[PDB]
Amino acid sequence: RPRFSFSIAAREGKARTGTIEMKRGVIRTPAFMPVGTAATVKALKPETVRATGADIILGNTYHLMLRPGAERIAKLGGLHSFMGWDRPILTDSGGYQVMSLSSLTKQSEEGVTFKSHLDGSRHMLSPERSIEIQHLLGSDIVMAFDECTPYPATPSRAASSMERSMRWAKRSRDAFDSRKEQAENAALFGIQQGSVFENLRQQSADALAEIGFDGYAVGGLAVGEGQDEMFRVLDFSVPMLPDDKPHYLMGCGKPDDIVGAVERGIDMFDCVNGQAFTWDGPINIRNARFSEDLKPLDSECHCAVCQKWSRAYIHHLIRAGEILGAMLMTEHNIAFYQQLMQKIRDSISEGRFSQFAQDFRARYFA
Amino acid sequence: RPRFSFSIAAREGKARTGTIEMKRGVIRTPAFMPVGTAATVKALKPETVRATGADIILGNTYHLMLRPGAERIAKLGGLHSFMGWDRPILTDSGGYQVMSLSSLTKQSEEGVTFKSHLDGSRHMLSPERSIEIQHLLGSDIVMAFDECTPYPATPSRAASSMERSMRWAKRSRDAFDSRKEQAENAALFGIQQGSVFENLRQQSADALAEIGFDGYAVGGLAVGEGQDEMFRVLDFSVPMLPDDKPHYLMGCGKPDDIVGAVERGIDMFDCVNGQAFTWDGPINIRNARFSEDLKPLDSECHCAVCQKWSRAYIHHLIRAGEILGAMLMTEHNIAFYQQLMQKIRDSISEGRFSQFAQDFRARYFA
Ligand SMILES: [Zn+2]
Ligand SMILES: [Zn+2]
């Protein structure tokens, strides 16, 4: 396999389906990436993550650099070996979690210094150091380091952070390229910023395309703006990105967010305890109504959890705070997301995705 | 298969190896039973419990009667169906945990009333109600309901509790026998009491043998007396029990407790977070010395955890409080216990168990 090859096999409207080929495996798109925080997808062995249908997982750099440490992971053979996942891993830059989880943060044009939320130890991230950490982890898809824009943001502040992010995108590009082993074996994605402002989104897309990346993320969304606004911004933002590269929407999308985002040209998603997804909408398994319900979590789901255990049992486990409850809920939910992606891929391939989206929504929100 | 058939295939000294055949499966002896508390063996799917080599698990009645409730479990099809374990289950009587976990406990000749430690709700257990609850769960091996003797106990109080326990053993026997479905499909074990006193142990063994049970537990040990005293009591107590029925030592035994107990004629064991068992003794995986240790938990262990992950990774997970850490530690530890039992069974079958016990101890305590 090549370092990186994105191929589009079929299209419907703005939606696309295809594959990303990388050295460690093929990723089917549109893709959902389960999130591994501190070198683990919560409550699941990697084999179970794979069994749900995942082709790639996300690793959170911020958590990894704190524990067990990036240099330590490299000494131990890299993240894949450490956690036992041998397929592609996309690593985030660490920037967002520094902003949201760390303390005593000090921002500058060079980067950010901060104190750990775990031990109060002092740490640093810059475009160069973020790219280096992602190299030390052995990441397959590296994210450029940027400066996030809070929602809501004034036009001036959104412009300032977008402009800094684009300067940092060039620094990320250059750091990645100067490291031969990384440049030859991994891919680098840039992140579009600009808040909800069309002109800033356009400037950001232009800057990123001029630098050139293997893929393009839409950053700065899923941060409190709501689905209507997110969809409105995606409507104008995604067409600004190069068509022939993957488009990655960063941040937890509910099933309905994913469907609408695919309708708007997004190819990749991520999303990190009593809520269970079903085709008739989410249920909270803690609800007393499930205490004697012998049906599986979802009536159609092909996951191992739905083949073997009842709502009543999972209700009991979750109410009791049992570890197996978290294990079963997480496996089902990730499996549900993967089945959603498969239905999306198949419907685009068959030119009936618009109908699928309508049918999905009618039932999910009935 | 029969309701119950214990066959002894080989012997060495007081040690025995053989099988218990029951309707739901064959149990190889000496046997280790992983413990399921509130209808789950902590952090493990039943398939994983089976994969470690377990033939039978223990279910804790006290926890089950509180949550989700015995009648509820029966309505839902029984414990096996509820939790997804289709092989034999031995249920305890609930008595010990009432004494150790419940509040506002009131004891009498009829039984015990108590308040839940979870919700403060009022509950009752008697020989009759305990046997009924075990029936509602669908238990394969039912334990007689007894009155535990604290350690240390005066000769008078040990005698009183032993005598009451024997009266309750007869009541348990009669309750079990009067329920046709239970009598025909399950087995009933009696529990020897008498604290550390040889004469009381003898009276208890005689009373139990006169009533007649399918198996005999040594109760009242592993409660603070220490291994030397436990072994001393087993030395005289086990020979008092009928030779041709299984002998069950109740309560957590470390690997060395199990080896010594088998040397003294015990056939069955149970035992319910950073401690990992190895053939060179236990290690605490939290210790900083393991942070960069790429070796598996144990160098010989054939478990899936030791095939796939390092001490360094498990150290990280446990220090981070990650659920996967508990999952991996528990699978390895139960698998270690099962490998211990297999080595015990094979060595008795080959007439080299005494040598095995010596070799095991020399290395485990080196
Ligand atoms: Zn499912
Ligand atoms: Zn192991």
Curated annotation (Swiss-Prot), chains A, B:
Disulphide-bonded residues: none
Region: RNA binding, residue numbers: 251-257
Any Pfam family hit: TGT
Binding residue positions for Zn(2+): C301, C303, C306, H332
GO molecular function, one term: tRNA-guanosine(34) queuine transglycosylase activity
Effect in UniProt of substituting D146A: Abolishes catalytic activity
Transmembrane is among the record's keywords: no
One GO term of the biological process aspect: tRNA wobble guanine modification
Catalytic residues as annotated in Swiss-Prot or TrEMBL: D92, D270
Pathway: tRNA modification; tRNA-queuosine biosynthesis
Positions of substrate binding: D92, S93, G94, G95, Y96, D146, Q193, G220
EC code: 2.4.2.29
Keywords: Glycosyltransferase, Metal-binding, Queuosine biosynthesis, Transferase, tRNA processing, Zinc
Cofactor(s) essential for the protein: Zn(2+)
Catalytic activity: 7-aminomethyl-7-carbaguanine + guanosine(34) in tRNA = 7-aminomethyl-7-carbaguanosine(34) in tRNA + guanine
The record's free-text note on cofactor binding: Binds 1 zinc ion per subunit.
InterPro entries in UniProt: ArchSynthase1/Queuine_TRR, TGT, TGT-like_sf, tRNA_ribo_trans-like
Protein function: Catalyzes the base-exchange of a guanine (G) residue with the queuine precursor 7-aminomethyl-7-deazaguanine (PreQ1) at position 34 (anticodon wobble position) in tRNAs with GU(N) anticodons (tRNA-Asp, -Asn, -His and -Tyr). Catalysis occurs through a double-displacement mechanism. The nucleophile active site attacks the C1' of nucleotide 34 to detach the guanine base from the RNA, forming a covalent enzyme-RNA intermediate. The proton acceptor active site deprotonates the incoming PreQ1, allowing a nucleophilic attack on the C1' of the ribose to form the product.
NCBIfam families xrefs: Q_tRNA_tgt, tgt_general
Subunit structure comment from the entry: Homodimer. Within each dimer, one monomer is responsible for RNA recognition and catalysis, while the other monomer binds to the replacement base PreQ1.
Stated name of the protein: Queuine tRNA-ribosyltransferase
Gene behind the chain: tgt
